[PDB]
Amino acid sequence: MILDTDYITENGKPVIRVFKKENGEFKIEYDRTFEPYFYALLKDDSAIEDVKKVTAKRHGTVVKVKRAEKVQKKFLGRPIEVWKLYFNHPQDVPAIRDRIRAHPAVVDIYEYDIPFAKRYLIDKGLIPMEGDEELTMLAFAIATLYHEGEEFGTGPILMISYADGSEARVITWKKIDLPYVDVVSTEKEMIKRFLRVVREKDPDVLITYNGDNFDFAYLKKRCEELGIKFTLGRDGSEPKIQRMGDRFAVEVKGRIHFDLYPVIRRTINLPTYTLEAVYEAVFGKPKEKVYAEEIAQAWESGEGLERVARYSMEDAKVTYELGREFFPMEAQLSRLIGQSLWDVSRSSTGNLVEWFLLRKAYKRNELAPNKPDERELARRRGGYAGGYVKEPERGLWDNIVYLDFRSLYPSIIITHNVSPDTLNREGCKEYDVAPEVGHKFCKDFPGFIPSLLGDLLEERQKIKRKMKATVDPLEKKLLDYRQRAIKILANSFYGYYGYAKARWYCKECAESVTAWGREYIEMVIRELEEKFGFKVLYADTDGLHATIPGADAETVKKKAKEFLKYINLELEYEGFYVRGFFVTKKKYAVIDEEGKITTRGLEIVRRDWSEIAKETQARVLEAILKHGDVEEAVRIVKEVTLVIHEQIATGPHVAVAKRLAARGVKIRPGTVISYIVLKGDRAIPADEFEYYIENQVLPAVERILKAFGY
């Protein structure tokens, strides 16, 4: 099973390494035969010999074209002849890149920004995670000592906990009598012990929960200080930092760093994404939280470390569980997309599609379109994110059912051959035309995307069947993940078409799918109401919320079931809510059987919500959704009518910075500040102690109860 790839330089030349785990033993395959390249479309075939004379300089040395050959490919279905330019080193590309394009005899260049190691996987048709090989995993966490105004990584690490399917221990340098705690001499020795623990277990996967932005970075600093070499890599190398625009991402050569945050962030949707919230909102068990403060005072007092050690133990244990849960899915996805799970698990749906397409484009000799440049990206004025919207039915409704119709869109792309290479193609014998928008989509030939899209659904349907007709409990679970993976990819093409950075961007395609979509949604709504007497309260691009007024759960459910069998592209019943209410087009809140409330656009977006404004809301919305008591929630506001734990030149802001600075606290990035407001005198640090109504508790519950008539 292939886990990943990368390249190493040796005598100036690139050497690909393929990290695999076969029959229980880890291995590295090397390849010195792969040559990097990119394409050049000459505006004149005669100017080739000269274009190969262009050079650039890298590491003081001069780089030039190693070799150029003419090839025949198709750009958007139509024949094109381009020059495949070879080089000696992957790094040559970004150097000479722009200068070759700028050459007077060159129209444009393509496939010049595809990472060598990814390019290798594609051009070689290698698929990561191809089988059923058992992979070992180890989750790890750390507890550190922190004090306000402390530059990052300044304080030491108090404990390093780790866990796997067999145990969950804690490594610390202070005496603690727990059977799982392990006391050592110093911090340095504790870190050394960890690297030693990791080295003996030698896990294929290291699971963390935000290790991409905290854990690894911290250990790095401490290691830089205590003078240690953090050699977690299976090749003795240290963790490597990769910055991905927004945040950073850390890799550990030879192993898979599975950071559960980017994943759970997507896969699940909550109000708070803290480890406690996540574990609870998944396993339904509670997790006790021990804050930095207590940690410090407990360490600097030798009083109560049994608790912190428990929390550290739990962090690692709880991380291993979540990782064992979300890993099988991510592995199937990565296999479908054909890229490393390290990459896949960190990618957006728009990018999962793009990688799938790139691989397929290669298989079909389809030259790929470039990402949008600065200019072109400006033209797209943001892409297209329009969709079908309604106008909710006011009031608090019961036993709501949720119809998901994201499965519609892919059928529509296949059905009308919606693709950028079929749109308004001249000289076709047959065309389908988008209602209201009028984009024409040729049908004489199957388009690139529609064509792939069809294949996926075929594949998925094949699996679902092989899955129901199987005695192998393992295979069943396995196939279930793959079918669920295909669904994810399939349902991302619609959005991808309007995603502004997309190479195969197609606002028209997107607009047309939206048009045809409206039609269909219109028809099923009608059928729902008339033939089934259902009440549709809310509908948007993803699905609708509806109930049979005055009926019960058992029936509204029963009834909704048959409607699907009747009306069925498949429509999935994805949700039942004991209560709910919709304020407008995108604003609303629902509660389910287990009680897990949910909301959307119910208040203004800000990061300075006071503890009261927050606690008041949850109480208002809990009386309504959990008790259908409006007067209740309203009498809760009246009487309720204290800190602001803002995360990181406003009235309070400036005032707070002075007060902190006044005692040496520097406001550092990515930290939380806690103040109280009381109109450089507006606010005051929490520790040392009207607006709070008309700019706090009111705005938090203003929309909610406006919808109920107040």
UniProtKB/Swiss-Prot annotation:
It catalyses: DNA(n) + a 2'-deoxyribonucleoside 5'-triphosphate = DNA(n+1) + diphosphate. Keywords: DNA replication, DNA-binding, DNA-directed DNA polymerase, Nucleotidyltransferase, Transferase. GO terms for molecular function: DNA binding; DNA-directed DNA polymerase activity; nucleotide binding. GO terms for biological process: DNA-templated DNA replication. Its EC number is 2.7.7.7. Pfam families: DNA_pol_B, DNA_pol_B_exo1. It comes from the Archaea. The keyword Nucleotidyltransferase applies. The keyword Phosphoprotein does not apply. Belongs to the DNA polymerase type-B family. This is DNA polymerase. It comes from Thermococcus sp. (strain 9oN-7).
